[PDB]
């Protein structure tokens, strides 16, 4: 819809693009025409997804304008230069897919970050610089099907509550410094593709590592 051009133009003007432009985002035109870079629309009627990748987006992201798009379900900002703590995507309670792969977001994600995002199906946080523990609210996402957090700086144990996530089919936590013992609930989960490799001090079933310290 033409009305959806107004929040999108504000979003465009809130981000710093260092490799490219969003000149196609022209106020007063319909973002669903086919002429707008990186816009997906439901049935060609209403904005449902924003895919702004490889534009060297720099600084942070705010969601106060994106929240004015009633039917927005997907955000993909992969392969940019964004930094700082995770932006407040939890204000977009209807979001179904969040992809932030290959940026420089940092910090420990607040444990309750994901509490309001009940519709989230896909969460890609890989290849960033997140630190600290996996936020416990991620395991409370009723609809989550895929979690990718590989290539970060995470530490601490893997929450066993991943094993109770009914819809979870892909779990990539590799290349971090997670530790402790792999939860049996994850090892036993049927129809799960899980990758826990390159977590040096993690032991147990899925990583094929005996926990016992051999003192030689």
């Amino acid at each position: 819809y033409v009305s959806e051009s107004e929040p999108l133009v504000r979003f465009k003007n809130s981000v710093k693009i260092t490799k490219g432009d969003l000149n196609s985002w022209r106020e007063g035109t319909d973002p669903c025409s086919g002429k707008w870079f990186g816009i997906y629309c439901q049935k060609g009627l209403t904005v449902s997804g924003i895919h702004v990748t490889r534009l060297g987006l720099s600084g942070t992201i705010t969601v106060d304008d994106l929240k004015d798009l009633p039917n927005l379900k997907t955000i993909r900002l992969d392969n940019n230069l964004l930094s700082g703590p995770l932006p407040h995507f939890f204000k977009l309670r209807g979001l179904k897919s969040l992809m932030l792969s290959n940026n420089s977001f940092s910090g420990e994600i607040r444990d309750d970050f994901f509490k309001d995002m009940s519709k989230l199906k896909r969460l890609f946080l890989d290849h960033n610089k997140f630190e600290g523990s996996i936020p416990s609210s991620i395991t409370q996402l009723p609809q989550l099907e895929e979690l990718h957090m590989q290539s970060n700086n995470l530490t601490g144990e893997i929450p066993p509550e991943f094993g109770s996530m009914k819809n979870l089919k892909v779990l990539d936590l590799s290349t971090n410094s997670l530790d402790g013992i792999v939860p049996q609930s994850i090892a036993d989960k049927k129809n799960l593709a899980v990758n826990l490799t390159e977590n040096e001090y993690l032991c147990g079933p899925v990583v094929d590592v005996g926990c016992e310290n051999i003192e030689l």
Binding site: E200, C203, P205, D208, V209, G210, C211, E212, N213, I214
Partner: protein
């Protein structure tokens, strides 16, 4: 040193019939695989 420690760790795992998986000299940690060689 670290290289000699992890050599001895690899030998210990071999004697148990496993692969070496984890070796830290500063933490004196040696872990082998659960699977067999």
């Amino acid at each position: 040193g670290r290289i000699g420690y992890c050599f001895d760790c690899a030998r210990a795992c071999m004697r148990r019939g496993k692969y070496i998986r984890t070796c830290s000299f500063e933490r004196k940690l040696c872990r082998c695989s659960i699977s067999d060689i």
